[PDB]
Amino acid sequence: HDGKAHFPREGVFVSNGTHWFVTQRNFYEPQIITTDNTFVSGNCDVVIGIVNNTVYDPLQLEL
């Protein structure tokens, strides 16, 4: 998202065919991908299997 690669802080990224969520590994509880679920590390040109998606910023959605 925006040229940056986001990895989950704890859990996995999953898709139900259409939408992308971030869930814990041992129990399916999907959640919206925000900047509190993920952490940024580097750019998108180095990870094999990266996908474009929207990572919602709580702060930028209010300010």
Binding site: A5, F7, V12, S41, V46, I48
Partner: protein, 49 residues
């Protein structure tokens, strides 16, 4: 997962990211060095014979 119930599939590169988080190293270390780590494993396996 197969030793504690049903066998749940998972891609091997993502499986190794789990096992890197189990030793205190973040998972972006693996995805950004995946080719190097793959070559180190293959070389280390070939030295056993």
């Amino acid at each position: 997962t197969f030793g504690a119930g049903p066998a749940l599939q998972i891609p091997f590169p993502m499986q190794m990211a789990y096992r890197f988080n189990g030793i205190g190293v973040t998972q972006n270390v693996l995805y950004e060095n995946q080719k190097l780590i793959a070559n180190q494993f293959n070389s280390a396996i070939g030295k056993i014979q």
